[model samples]
Target chain A: DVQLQESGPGLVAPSQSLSITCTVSGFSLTDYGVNWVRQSPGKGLEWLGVIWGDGITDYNSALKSRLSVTKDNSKSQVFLKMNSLQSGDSARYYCVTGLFDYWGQGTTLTVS
Target chain B: ADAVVTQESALTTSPGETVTLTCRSSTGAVTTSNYASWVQEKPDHLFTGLIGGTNNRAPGVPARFSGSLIGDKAALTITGAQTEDEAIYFCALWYSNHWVFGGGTKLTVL
Candidate 1:
């Protein structure tokens, strides 16, 4: 019965940062893992990285330099921050739980 | 991240026919130590993972959905392909404590 919802700004100008938050319910942060995935317009699914309850993190080798995932266990929320965003970064980002079992409704981010 | 060796071809099927999609790990072992996940993308581009591990269906998945591991490859099968079943199916392997999605198979039900 776990549910995930994503919240963030809808748009960002080029050379800026993009941030998003995923809210969780019905599960504790330590009990399950949460990760971020994105899909650009007419593109494939790309793994951004993951945030574990214990504060450990992993990212795609291609994006490791620009991506950061952090969580607030007390608030049951996971945050994603990507610095120096570009137009190529514009996409629908979703927060996933467990073995990709649960997913957020997704938030669309556009770079102008 | 691990590389998932999945087919990029389209799996075409006639009504009531059975179709299977294959997902193999390009790296790491596919024994009991690994977990597999299957996802499908509808015509509208909506995606959902239908199965995980050795045939564990995710929430809201149909009974016809099933997954299995054979040798070093993980496979997903759909027993009865209805016309609406045409879509892109993807598979992935869980290894090194991470999940990697396949290249995806475009399914066409004729």
Candidate 2:
């Protein structure tokens, strides 16, 4: 029974950085990768990036320049940091387990 | 990353009828060569992975939900659609270490 929860600020200023935390339980970060995905309001899903179990990261080309994914295996938590935030970046961000079998409730980020 | 194409932006079907959603890849045929994942997002924001590959359903998914490759394209078919099955269906292709999702198909079960 794996579960994930995302926590972060609901609002951010344009041109600033946005950081969100994914706290997971019932799974080991060292055994499975965690991916950051977002959905714009009334839009489709976007794959942002991923932090593999080995700690290596891969990102969407569109967001590579501004995205960073990291994790703390001991805490079973993953972090997503993306700079140069804009209104377009505002969305509901989620942390999903590999293959997206499990997902967090998602945190809504609003850029003001 | 390869581009994913989902032909239908929206679909409506009567309860107990079957609904098939199609997803195609712009670069090549979608096969077991790469992983294909299906996700269902309901109105309440509950996202669930329904299938993987050509026909592997996730845990807790109903048997009415199935996936297969139909002549170069991947398909998700919902047999005997239920009212609760109405939601947005997204197909994702895992290629070159990145995941690309289709535009999504909005399903409404009448």
Candidate that would win on lDDT: 2
* Overall local distance difference test of candidate 1: 0.80
Model 1 CAPRI rating: acceptable
Fraction of true contacts retained by every candidate, in order, equals 0.20, 0.62
| lDDT, candidate 2, A21-69, per-residue tens | 9999988999888989999977868999998889999999988899999
Off by over 4 Å in 1: B1-4
Q: After superposition, how far is residue B20 of candidate 1 from its true place, in Å?
A: 0.6
lDDT of 1 at B90: 75
Per-residue accuracy of model 1 over B38-95 as CA lDDT, tens digit each: 7777855466778877688987888777888766777788898789788888776666
Largest TM-score belongs to which candidate?
2
DockQ of candidate 1 compared with the true complex: 0.46
